[PDB]
Structures are given as structure tokens and as C-alpha cells.
Amino acid sequence: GVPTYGAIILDETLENVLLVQGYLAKSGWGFPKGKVNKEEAPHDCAAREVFEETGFDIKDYICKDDYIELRINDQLARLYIIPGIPKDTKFNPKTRREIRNIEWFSIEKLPCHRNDMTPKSKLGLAPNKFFMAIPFIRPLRDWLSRRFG
Numbered sequence: 001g002v003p004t005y006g007a008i009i010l011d012e013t014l015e016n017v018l019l020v021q022g023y024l025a026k027s028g029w030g031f032p033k034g035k036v037n038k039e040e041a042p043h044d045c046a047a048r049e050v051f052e053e054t055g056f057d058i059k060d061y062i063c064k065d066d067y068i069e070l071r072i073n074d075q076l077a078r079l080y081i082i083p084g085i086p087k088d089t090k091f092n093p094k095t096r097r098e099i100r101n102i103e104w105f106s107i108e109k110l111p112c113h114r115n116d117m118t119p120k121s122k123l124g125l126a127p128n129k130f131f132m133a134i135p136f137i138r139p140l141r142d143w144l145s146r147r148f149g
């Protein structure tokens with residue numbers, strides 16, 4: 001898999017995160033991110049994908065050591081952590097063939113796992129519109145605890 005890069009954008013209170021909603025296969029809510037081009041540095045891909053999907057330029061705010069990285073089915077995803085962006089910021093995708101909506105969500109209300117179906121004696125997981133964000137939620141809460149208490 002080609003690595004992906006993007007951002008976890010938080011507001012000034014540290015309560016809220018910015019998610020984006022795609023279409024079709026990407027029809028739920030997730031962090032803004034995308035696949036690296038040939039020769040492109042990680043920090044540059046993260047600002048490019050985030051600017052295409054949100055209209056906000058993170059390049060002046062990226063810190064090189066502040067990120068959460070996960071490997072999911074043998075594809076690496078790294079999201080740079082960007083705190084203190086005001087909730088009244090105007091966000092506007094470039095690409096509205098790709099992005100349906102852009103919204104702030106309360107971190108403490110987001111799920112950090114999907115629910116099973118053990119009430120129906122059935123295997124697997126119930127559908128959840130946050131499926132693409134979910135793997136990052138617990139590592140983000142632990143990172144914010146360590147760095148801010």
C-alpha cells in the first residue's frame with residue numbers, strides 16, 4: 001500500500017475534532033488524509049490532502065514529532081496533530097465531487113470501537129458511520145492525556 005498522510009485538527013478547548021464525510025466507499029466520517037505522490041515529503045502530502053478536503057492550510061502549524069501513526073491491513077496512515085484552530089474557521093473543500101460535508105464532533109462522544117451483535121447471537125460488527133475514524137480515537141485520547149493532562 002502507498003502510505004497516507006493527513007491531520008487531526010482540534011479546536012481551542014481541545015474537546016472537538018474536525019471530520020470530513022466522503023461518498024460511496026468513503027460514505028462515512030473520517031480524518032482528512034490521502035495517498036502520498038512519488039518523491040513527496042510526508043509533511044507536504046499532509047498539507048496538500050488537508051487543503052484539498054477542507055480548504056484550510058496547516059503548513060505553518062505542523063509539528064514534526066506530533067502525530068499518530070497506525071498500520072491498517074498493511075497500509076500506513078500518519079495524522080499530524082494540529083490543536084487550537086478556532087471553531088468559527090470557514091472550511092470549504094476544493095473537491096466537492098469527493099467531500100459531502102465537514103463538521104466538528106465532540107471527542108468524548110465519538111466511539112472508540114464498534115458494537116458487536118451478541119444480542120442477536122450473530123458474529124461481526126454493527127454498521128457505524130464513524131468506522132474510518134474509530135481506530136485513531138483511543139490513541140488520540142491517550143496522546144492528549146500525556147501532552148496536556
Ligand SMILES: c1cnc(NC2CCCCCC2)nc1
Pocket residue numbers: 020021022023026028029030031032033034053099132133
Ligand atoms: C480513515 C479512512 N479514511 C479517511 N478519510 C477518507 C478520505 C476522504 C475524506 C472523507 C472520508 C474518507 N479517514 C480515516
